[PDB]
Write a protein that binds this ligand. Structure first.
Ligand SMILES: O=c1cc(O)n([C@@H]2O[C@H](COP(=O)(O)O)[C@@H](O)[C@H]2O)c(=O)[nH]1
Ligand SMILES: O=c1cc(O)n([C@@H]2O[C@H](COP(=O)(O)O)[C@@H](O)[C@H]2O)c(=O)[nH]1
Lengths: 215, 215
């Protein structure tokens, strides 16, 4: 992705989301849109963004249902124009396979979320994360999400998925993660509040890119 | 809930969803609306249903993000009129607490999803489910979701949460679960395809209720 930086656009107002995304567009080529924005403004926001900014859109819907419901969620999401969808691995292989099947049918991609970045991830997800990543490899998953807040875990996850797999990583900035250290293992970093709550989002994005280019 | 039966309305078309829900309204008082319908027709469908049918609406969004994002998802969901939201417990206590805080602020309820009903739930969720339920009890959660497909697990979950807690259970019908056996442990059953794909949804609902009344 452009500059290895993905914007997590979690503002819940279309006008503010459009303003900030437009201000930082020269620095990115991929926007992660999740439920905070979609549940506030509608699924049409995905095609609006894709068109207005010509960016790729990753729908961060942390899909985590039974296979049959996961298939429906993925079909609705790709119909709305999303390029990729983020899926939880913890509900198991059949639930992930259902998403992979719809992505294959529709010419799109699935990102598998392994370990999460927040403190509570240590309770149950962390202990299962290596196995979730191995499950991804066995299912043919090529895109993964891992935590900026725990670079030693990001390293172990990169070890499991290999160098050919694409790995993106949230938790940079507000949650404490560092751009440069995270990019030692991930291909791209996801950044939300550090950019969208900044007094000058473009300056915040530029600052991050400068520290990345130096790597 | 009326007749201890909750309709899982996972049709993706507003006209079909309204038709089926209207046909079975005399047999229920609670409709579970999830992402298949919301991502296809918009969040306004929640208030439309609540108004048209005078039913309680559980938003089955399997919330499974970091605390900050979970708070935003819950606020948007309750603003749309949902009476309750279903939250995954696998992501940990801070993520669940964020949802409980918004429900307290807005006078609504949180249902904690413990073990899931599909086969893949055996891979990672089942091994953590008793602990997820105990976490719910420690956080003060009073509403839970457990699997119709594994009544021995539903029994163990009921044992952990106590008799005062409210427990609802999906996996009845299409996934193999039985109404009567499930109601030995759960307060209400969730039924989707067995009713909404039936040639006569009202007859299917009536049939289930007749077998429930006999209990
Ligand atoms: O483990 C994970 C997975 C995520 O998708 N995310 C998501 O990435 C973004 C992080 O945003 P922020 O930079 O404001 O902390 C949010 O949209 C969040 O939902 C995360 O923070 N941790
Ligand atoms: O463990 C769980 C948790 C759920 O919410 N569900 C949900 O309950 C419904 C089950 O519907 P059905 O009766 O068609 O199998 C679906 O909406 C599904 O997403 C489930 O099946 N298993």
């Amino acid at each position: 992705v452009m500059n290895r930086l993905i914007l997590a656009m979690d503002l819940m107002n279309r006008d503010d989301a459009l303003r900030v995304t437009g201000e930082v567009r020269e620095y990115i080529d991929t926007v992660k849109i999740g439920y905070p924005l979609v549940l506030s403004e509608g699924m049409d926001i995905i095609a609006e963004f894709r068109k207005r900014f010509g960016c790729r859109i990753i729908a961060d819907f942390k899909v985590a249902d039974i296979p049959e419901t996961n298939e429906k969620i993925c079909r609705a999401t790709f119909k709305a124009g999303a390029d990729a969808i983020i899926v939880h691995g913890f509900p198991g292989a059949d639930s992930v396979r259902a998403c992979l099947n719809v992505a294959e049918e529709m010419g799109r991609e699935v990102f598998l979320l392994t370990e999460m970045s927040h403190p509570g991830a240590e309770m149950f997800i962390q202990g299962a994360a290596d196995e979730i990543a191995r499950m991804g490899v066995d299912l043919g998953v090529k895109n993964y999400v891992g935590p900026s807040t725990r670079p030693e875990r990001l390293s172990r996850l990169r070890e499991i998925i290999g160098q050919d797999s694409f790995l993106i990583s949230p938790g940079v900035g507000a949650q404490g993660g560092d751009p440069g250290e995270t990019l030692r293992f991930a291909d791209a970093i996801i950044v939300g509040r550090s950019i969208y709550l900044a007094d000058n989002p473009a300056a915040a994005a530029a600052g991050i890119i400068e520290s990345i280019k130096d790597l």
